Amino acid sequence: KSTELLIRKLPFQRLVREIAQDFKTDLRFQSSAVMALQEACEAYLVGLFEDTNLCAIHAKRVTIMPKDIQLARRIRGER
Amino acid sequence: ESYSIYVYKVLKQVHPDTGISSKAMGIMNSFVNDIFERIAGEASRLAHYNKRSTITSREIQTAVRLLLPGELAKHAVSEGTKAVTKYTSSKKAKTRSSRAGLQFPVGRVHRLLRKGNYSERVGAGAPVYLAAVLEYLTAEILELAGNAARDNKKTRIIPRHLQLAIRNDEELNKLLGKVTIA
């Protein structure tokens, strides 16, 4: 709908199939499956970037740095 | 529900000469109820996703794979498949618990599975698989908590020994997610 697909579909689909190879299990992916993955990944990244920008503001900095990403993920409870 | 006597049996099997305190026993019981609720909840959602009306050993196995981390998942799946095949190969044992070669009560597990209204019907192999998974996790925790008690030169497992066993194991800490206890 309103969401625009920023990430190019082909390289993302390459990445999804690489992740299948690392797991060492051979399965096929529907096109609808790959697009739902792409929408979720982009949304998660945007949401993480929002929290990251919040951290950068708190530091009185206009530029975001890996410090900001790590702090936001740490509070979120990720690994 | 109370699983304490079965945890005591498991404790005597991995560490024959190690006891446990009342607070530490209550911790083990709450862990078993917590994971039972999580695995049972995951098996019911899988049963409604595939439009089945019955939970079998397959639904319990996929639930355990989803909730436990890698090695714990591999070890729990192995124990579950072994208990099902023992129960599926031989009819000779008088009790359903000894039929699968388990200390945990398969009958109590099957009764609680049906009580929770997780599905229309509960298969025969699901409670055996769930009991085996619960037994292995209790064994791994009690083995590590017993190892901590031996290193402290304590003859019984107290709460802090349980905490050390959990958070020092990556997968055990991830599985409990640092649940709070005091």
Partner: protein, 310 residues
């Protein structure tokens, strides 16, 4: 505050030099940039504005090399035995760094092109990074040759690094052969491992995702050093590294008034070791309260049996 021997500059061919270096700390409120030259007994830093700062080989307590891998700059750091003054006030740490590049790319209509040429520019950045690391490595080898093993550079072990907040900023601290170091952020953190009496870990308990690390020096007038808010996942690795440098460590749930503890020790150093020395950091009611499990309320019958069968 401490007199320094005059720099021995010889005019000859042997003059290892390195360009494009920013000095920390600066001399004015503006970032002074210049060049570093390796002479007979020390270093001479020549600024564009003519400013010259000298550092003797014998005055260097820790020469440190931070490669540009994983960072935005590449740094040569020097922690000195005695403080020196080149600007107002005295500075105990002097470093020289070169930026990798792309420090702050900003978003907007200027980067709206989003061309695919960034792959080639990435190679140009990779060549620049390999150029910067190779030039720093060659300059270090020339200088280590000149001193005749008087001074050895140390490279941090990023495998042993951890995140902590000594200076109210969560940075990365990396052990070296001789010290625990973080030289990517000014002010720098340098603690000599030899000068550490012991380590005490505070706020270590279940359900906590962070802890404080306390560094106590063999010199008891020196205030302890705090490293706050380290992830609990880094505790066991740090402990092991301490065991490799023979540094004793203890644990504690409660944070301790170290300024008071040091004062009590220094005002009566004798009575402190008569109670046992540092025996208070390591343990040796709760046993009496707790009750060991016994069979109670009999047990479930477990004899219900029955099965679906066919």
């Amino acid at each position: 505050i401490v007199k320094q021997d005059s720099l021995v500059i010889n005019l000859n061919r042997s003059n290892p030099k390195l360009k494009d270096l920013y000095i920390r700390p600066n001399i004015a409120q503006k970032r002074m940039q210049g060049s570093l030259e390796a002479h007979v007994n020390g270093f001479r830093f020549t600024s564009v504005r003519g400013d010259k700062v000298d550092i003797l080989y014998n005055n260097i307590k820790h020469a440190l090399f931070q490669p540009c891998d994983g960072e935005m700059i590449i740094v040569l750091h020097f922690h000195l035995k005695n403080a020196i003054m080149f600007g107002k006030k005295r500075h105990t740490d002097v470093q020289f760094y070169t930026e990798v590049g792309e420090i702050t790319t900003d978003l907007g209509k200027h980067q709206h092109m989003h061309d695919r040429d960034d792959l080639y520019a990435e190679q140009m950045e990779r060549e620049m990074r390999h150029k910067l690391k190779t030039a720093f490595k060659n300059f270090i080898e020339k200088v280590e040759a000149l001193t005749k093993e008087e001074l050895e550079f140390e490279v941090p072990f990023r495998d042993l690094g951890f995140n902590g907040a000594p200076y109210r900023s969560t940075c990365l601290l990396q052990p070296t052969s001789s010290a625990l170091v973080n030289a990517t952020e000014w002010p720098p953190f340098v603690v000599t491992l030899d000068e550490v009496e012991l380590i005490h870990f505070e706020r270590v308990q279940f359900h906590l995702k962070n802890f404080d690390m306390v560094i106590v020096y063999k010199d008891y007038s020196k205030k302890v050093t705090m490293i706050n808010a380290i992830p609990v996942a880094s505790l066991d690795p740090i402990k092991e590294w301490l065991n490799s440098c023979d540094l004793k460590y203890t644990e504690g749930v409660q944070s301790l008034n170290w300024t008071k503890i040091m004062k009590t020790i220094v005002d009566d150093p004798e009575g402190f070791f008569e109670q046992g020395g540092w025996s208070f950091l390591e343990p040796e009611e709760s046993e009496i309260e707790d009750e060991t499990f016994n069979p109670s309320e009999d047990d479930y019958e477990e004899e219900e049996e029955d099965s679906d069968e066919d």
